[PDB]
Amino acid sequence: TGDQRFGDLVFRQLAPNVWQHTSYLDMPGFGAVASNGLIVRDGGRVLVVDTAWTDDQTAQILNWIKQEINLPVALAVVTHAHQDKMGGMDALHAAGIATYANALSNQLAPQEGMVAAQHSLTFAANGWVEPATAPNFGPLKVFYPGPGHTSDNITVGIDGTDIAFGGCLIKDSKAKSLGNLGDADTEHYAASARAFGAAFPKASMIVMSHSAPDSRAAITHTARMADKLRKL
Ligand SMILES: [Zn+2]
Ligand SMILES: [Zn+2]
């Protein structure tokens, strides 16, 4: 398939300098739910998008990076204040890694049971990150598409590649539903999915948290699901 197992994690190379990390929730009354993030090698440093579900899983991502890449991890960006994306913040901080999240994610973190990132990203009215808040992000192009899966969800394009990461906002083109809607903005979801597509109009590989990588059909399918839900 392209997947490789390392401990209880799975890694899949997407480009010469990009890998998808996958971790699984291990809690007594739940099935083994996968969550995907990214690892980007930016020359002489590594950038991480999203933690795993737990600190121990996140430390295993760092161990894979040390073994397989062996460059320092300069920063991590987390895409919203849920456990699958921010559950391993303490492991990043223990490792001396600078962490960034939407200001709103950092505000929500205590209510959600998450540790806040060290740095807050803010956004222009067009959705693009304010550059002074995202210094030295290299190829990572951060975009806030509007409320959707959550009020705080952000997305990330990787310059020099065909890849854009929708996080938990985007589901694949065969998804039966929008997954976890507990915190979702049903009025704006479809427009936010569309805004993600329009922000990264050349991306051909759409990476998402809870499906395998897909084509741009994931974006349109997600927006349709959202529009149906809104019309009910
Ligand atoms: Zn979520
Ligand atoms: Zn999720």
Swiss-Prot record:
Domain of life: Bacteria
GO molecular function, one term: beta-lactamase activity
Keywords: Antibiotic resistance, Hydrolase, Metal-binding, Periplasm, Plasmid, Signal, Zinc
Activity regulation annotation text: Inhibits by captopril, thiorphan, dimercaprol and tiopronin. This enzyme is not susceptible to inactivation by the beta-lactamase-blocking agents clavulanic acid.
Catalytic activity: a beta-lactam + H2O = a substituted beta-amino acid
Record text on cofactor binding: Binds 2 Zn(2+) ions per subunit.
Entry binding sites for Zn(2+) 1: 80, 82, 149
Major subcellular location class: periplasm
GO cellular component: periplasmic space
Cofactor: Zn(2+)
SUPFAM superfamilies named in the record: Metallo-hydrolase/oxidoreductase
Positions that bind Zn(2+) 2: 84, 168, 210
UniProt-listed InterPro entries: Metallo-B-lactamas, NDM-1-like, RibonucZ/Hydroxyglut_hydro
Miscellaneous comment: Enterobacteriaceae carrying this gene (identified by PCR) have been isolated in Sweden, India, Pakistan, Bangladesh, England, Scotland, Northern Ireland, Australia and the USA. The organisms they were identified in were K.pneumoniae, Enterobacter cloacae, E.coli, Proteus spp, Citrobacter freundii, Morganella morganii, Providencia spp and Klebsille oxytoca. In India most isolates were from community-acquired infections rather than hospital-acquired infections, indicating the gene is widespread in the environment.
Cited PANTHER family: ACYL-COENZYME A THIOESTERASE MBLAC2, METALLO-BETA-LACTAMASE DOMAIN-CONTAINING
Family note: Belongs to the metallo-beta-lactamase superfamily. Class-B beta-lactamase family.
Quaternary organization: Monomer.
Name used for this protein in its record: Metallo-beta-lactamase type 2
Gene: blaNDM-1
